Design a binder for this molecule. Structure first.
Ligand code: SAH
Ligand code: SAH
Lengths: 327, 327
């Protein structure tokens, strides 16, 4: 016994996310021809599930590297499944692990909220450089970031709550809408929240593409990744801000398999990352929404995501609002 | 503007709790004959809603005392409802507020999780002693605590999760049930969680009664409140521990109005407080469950609730497990 509530809950949530975990299983299995008889490094193996997917896909040897105490559980899951000759669970950070050979492939689930919040991406790139054979397989191989203006229905309900008190209790609290807006939208924190398709006000725009084999990607991440965007709204709505999300792609190796966290696709534990304006803005059919967005490490905590945003909605003047990931 | 996310969310949750807020409205209105033309102190007035209920009930003057920044919102709700001649919002803690008279009544919603976690009860008793007229009204007037053995279905699902991985992903993770049990039940924290009637394994037992007018109740709270209990289980079940909850009573004052947080009654934001055994124990029809329970302030933080529990299930030996409120 050690206190392990966080350990089990985090791994439960990941494995319960079927969209995530099936995307990795099928993404890996579809590369069976490239993995059969080959070696694999699983960066951040957790409970060992992806390492075992690789063995199912036919790998001769999988190195399951895991820095935290959950490695103990990984060792047990492998022993219990009788795969200890094929999957070797190794303690500690990938940056200092010692493998006996370069590998044919790396597999990793490294993506954080907003893709880059508290992500293991730097560790995956460190391992690719140190251990992956020239021309080796990376699963997934790339990631893309998307942005779109949104109307959050749950936020709308919360903003309107104070005007419904009279109907329920004979006390008029509608004067608190200002207060509620300032508290719920006036902050500078990125809010993780699940939206649906009807919340999306325009065509989503891709604003960055991250090819994990690209030279200098580590330095891109430090300078900031992102870019400009532009879109046109579909109809009348209270725009509350933007949602950002990602997808990652597995080569087939056939056509690629995409794991998406878009509000149009089945929900994942990543949900989306929301960037609220200080207050709502009414948009109409064809309202132009544009801007420039950058994702980079926070100054005071290099594993916390910060977002620099400059945007323009219709005829409103350009505005800056910069965010950091919620506590 | 100040950062006020916590402010609005806490008050939203309280006012959205209709069971709570209607119990106070009807509890107060039913005492209209005793309040009409009289004076009231609202201890911890928040947004001012209970103070306005008192004015609706006919009070001549209500002192709405509130220690934190939400007082500013209270002042606005009163101004906006045009009740500033009848309801006076006053800043700061009730312990140092200066009223111009003793009052005919105190109203307060002071109850925390498990009744006594981070509760304002000491402040209500301080105000009763300092400001309430001899024979004055207290709303509510009393509280009662209850305990019962439980089977938590949501916990059961979480304990069983690891044995379902094989069906979904071809990896057998059933060997992790031990781990999951240790992490989810082996800790010593009180867990706030909503149960339903079917989770209850026996007749609930009252283990304490707190009459707010009782002399020396402050000293009882410091020594610990609680007592012994005994009950008999209804049928075969995996017992996970105990749930505790409270009710408070408003004199009519007609028959009393009771605000209950029992799992048999409509859900409130208080839910119930759960005390998990280190692992499940199978019980049967007529299994005797007994013990002794005390609620008191934690040593290192006098506003955190601690629970001392000694219990016996059937033929199992007596056991001690002591808890402190979750972070
Ligand atoms: N630098 C590093 N080296 C090794 N493991 C790391 C690491 N940084 C984070 N980790 C671990 O990587 C894991 C990411 S979570 C993904 C777990 C598992 N592969 C699954 O898909 O279900 C966590 O268990 C975390 O402890
Ligand atoms: N010692 C004290 N004096 C005055 N206010 C206090 C206090 N201790 C806590 N409070 C305040 O008491 C409130 C309790 S929450 C209840 C709020 C409101 N009466 C309602 O029923 O909706 C909080 O707003 C908290 O800031």
């Amino acid at each position: 016994y050690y206190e392990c509530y966080s350990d089990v809950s985090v791994h439960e949530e990941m494995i319960a996310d079927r969209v995530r975990t099936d995307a990795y299983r099928l993404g890996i299995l579809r590369n069976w021809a490239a993995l059969r008889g080959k070696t694999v490094l699983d960066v951040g193996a957790g409970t060992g599930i992806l390492s075992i997917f690789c063995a199912q896909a036919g790998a001769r040897r999988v190195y399951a590297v895991e820095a935290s105490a959950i490695w103990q559980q990984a060792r047990e899951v492998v022993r219990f499944n009788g795969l200890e000759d094929r999957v070797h669970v190794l303690p500690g950070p990938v940056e200092t692990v010692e493998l006996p050979e370069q590998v044919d492939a790396i597999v990793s689930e490294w993506m954080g909220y907003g893709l880059l919040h508290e992500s293991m991406l730097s560790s995956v790139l460190h391992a690719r450089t140190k251990w992956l054979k020239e021309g080796g397989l990376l699963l997934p191989a790339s990631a893309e970031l998307f942005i779109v203006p949104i109307s959050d229905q749950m936020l709308e309900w919360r903003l309107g709550f104070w005007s419904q008190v009279k109907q329920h209790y004979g006390v008029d609290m509608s004067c608190l809408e200002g207060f509620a807006t300032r508290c719920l939208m006036g902050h500078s924190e990125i809010v993780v929240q699940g939206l649906s398709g009807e919340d999306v006000l325009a065509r989503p725009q891709r604003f960055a593409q991250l090819e994990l084999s690209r030279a200098g990607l580590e330095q891109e991440l430090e300078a900031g990744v992102g870019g400009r965007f532009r879109c046109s709204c579909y109809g009348s709505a209270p725009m509350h801000g933007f949602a950002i999300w990602f997808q990652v792609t597995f080569p087939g190796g056939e056509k690629p398999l995409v794991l998406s966290t878009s509000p149009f696709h089945p929900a994942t534990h990543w949900k989306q990352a929301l960037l609220y304006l200080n207050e709502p803005v009414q948009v109409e059919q064809d309202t132009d929404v544009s801007g420039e967005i950058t994702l980079l490490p926070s100054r005071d905590n290099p594993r916390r995501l910060r977002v620099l945003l400059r945007y323009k909605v219709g005829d409103q003047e350009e505005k800056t609002k910069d965010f950091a990931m919620e506590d």
